[PDB]
């Protein structure tokens with residue numbers, strides 16, 4: 001059910017683009033292919049991607065970002081972050097974007113470069 | 122070149138230097154206290170020959186290196202506090218430098234990235250008390 005060299009799991013397809021880029025840049029790449037940065041369903045699909053990338057990269061970009069005006073994290077789908085559903089380690093003193101380390105989820109500079117994972121269905 | 126002499130096991134020799142590439146990721150502050158522990162420093166390059174090697178050997182992981190700045194405004198400095206003077210400009214708005222697949226970039230202390238250590242060469246051993 002997945003396009004070639006895309007990895008299926010729990011009715012989404014995933015892809016791990018093989019180049020490190022900024023948050024905005026990653027958003028645009030996925031969004032330009034008829035896909036989106038990750039939108040974390042459950043603490044399972046995190047473990048899956050975390051395995052999938054364990055051999056490749058130490059962290060990756062997900063569709064989640066802190067907007068100094070709101071003082072709110074926001075999934076790239078509109079919805080404010082359900083604070084219960086994810087603990088995010090880092091400073092939120094300036095705009096930030098969420099990258100998923102193997103063991104944590106981090107508040108990063110949005111101009112740092114990172115592996116990103118594309119999501120469809 | 123005073124003479125030829127190998128780098129210790131798990132290190133890679135390039136010019137008057139020995140390079141190390143960590144196997145697990147960590148934050149910048151720890152990565153340094155680990156290099157220091159090995160009587161070394163967060164990887165520094167002085168030649169092009171060195172930088173070219175770093176860029177190619179790197180592989181899919183990004184690696185922390187020697188460059189810090191006190192802020193977005195102030196200038197880039199190696200572990201020893203020498204100014205960074207080399208015409209590859211470090212990307213990003215941030216205070217701690219690491220190896221992209223597209224050159225060098227910068228992220229916050231607490232980012233989880235592998236790291237590289239550099240040390241100079243010699244056939245017997247001179248100690249940093």
Ligand SMILES: *[C@@H]1O[C@H](CO)[C@@H](O[C@@H]2O[C@H](CO)[C@@H](O)[C@H](O)[C@H]2NC(C)=O)[C@H](O)[C@H]1NC(C)=O
Pocket residue numbers: 038039040041042075077078079081082085086
């Ligand atoms: C935007 O995406 C997030 C998930 O990435 C949605 O919030 C989640 O919805 C699930 C499934 O219903 C809930 O069980 C969780 O509370 C939320 N997950 C997390 C990790 O917070 C959000 O509703 C999405 N918005 C839209 C328009 O679908």
Ligand SMILES: *[C@@H]1O[C@H](CO)[C@@H](O[C@@H]2O[C@H](CO)[C@@H](O)[C@H](O)[C@H]2NC(C)=O)[C@H](O)[C@H]1NC(C)=O
Pocket residue numbers: 147148150151230231
């Ligand atoms: C950087 O990483 C080191 C190790 O990865 C962290 O040090 C650990 O901190 C906890 C409590 O803070 C201790 O119980 C661990 O045993 C420590 N490990 C070591 C090896 O020192 C450190 O907290 C991290 N720094 C930042 C800024 O996140």
Ligand SMILES: *[C@@H]1O[C@H](CO)[C@@H](O)[C@H](O)[C@H]1NC(C)=O
Pocket residue numbers: 051052
């Ligand atoms: C992790 O990824 C590898 C490579 O795709 C795969 O072959 C393996 O089945 C996965 N392992 C786990 C523990 O999920």
Ligand SMILES: *[C@@H]1O[C@H](CO)[C@@H](O)[C@H](O)[C@H]1NC(C)=O
Pocket residue numbers: 206207
């Ligand atoms: C700084 O860069 C310039 C390159 O034109 C060079 O002339 C100068 O020697 C460099 N600094 C040091 C410490 O060598």
Ligand SMILES: [Zn+2]
Pocket residue numbers: 160246247248249
């Ligand atoms: Zn010693």
